C-alpha cells in the first residue's frame with residue numbers, strides 16, 4: 001500500500017527526528033523537501049548519520065517514532 | 081499537501097498509539113482499516129477515548145508520536 005519513494009536506513013541504530021533532544025523535527029508530514037535536505041538521524045554508539053533526501057517531493061509519511069531502533073534497509077520516510 | 085481523509089482529535093489530551101505501554105500499535109502506515117477499527121487513544125486525566133475509523137481505507141500517515149499532547153481538531157491519522 002505504501003506507494004512513493006521510500007528512504008531507508010543505511011545502518012543499524014536508533015532513529016531520531018530531531019538534531020537534539022530539545023529541537024524541533026527536521027521534517028513533518030506534508031512538508032516539501034529538496035534533494036540534500038536532512039530528514040532524520042540514525043545513531044549507533046554516538047556515530048550519528050544524517051539521512052538526506054535523494055529526491056525532491058512532499059513527505060507523505062514517517063514510519064518510525066523517535067528513539068526507536070531501526071535495521072539496515074528499514075523504511076523510514078516516504079516521499080511523494 | 082496532506083490529501084486524504086483526516087481523522088482528528090475529538091479532545092484535548094495525550095495521544096497514544098497503543099492499548100498499553102507494552103502493547104503493539106493499533107495501526108501502522110500501510111495497514112488497511114475498516115469502519116469501527118481503533119486507530120489510537122487520546123487521554124486526559126485518565127479519561128481514555130478510543131478513536132475509531134469512520135471510513136474504510138489504507139493508513140497513509142500518522143501525524144503525531146505517542147506521548148505527545150494534542151489539541152481539539154488536531155490531525156492525527158490520514159486514511160486513503
Ligand SMILES: *C(=O)CCCC[C@@H]1SC[C@@H]2NC(=O)N[C@@H]21
Nearest residue numbers: 016017018019020021022041046
Ligand atoms: C548519547 O547517547 C546522548 C544523547 C544523544 C542525543 C542525540 S542529538 C541528535 C539526536 N536527536 C535527539 O533527540 N537525540 C539524538
Ligand SMILES: *C(=O)CCCC[C@@H]1SC[C@@H]2NC(=O)N[C@@H]21
Nearest residue numbers: 096097098099100101102121126
Ligand atoms: C496514567 O497516567 C498511567 C499510564 C496510562 C497508560 C495508558 S494505557 C493506554 C495508553 N497507551 C499507552 O501506551 N499508555 C496509555
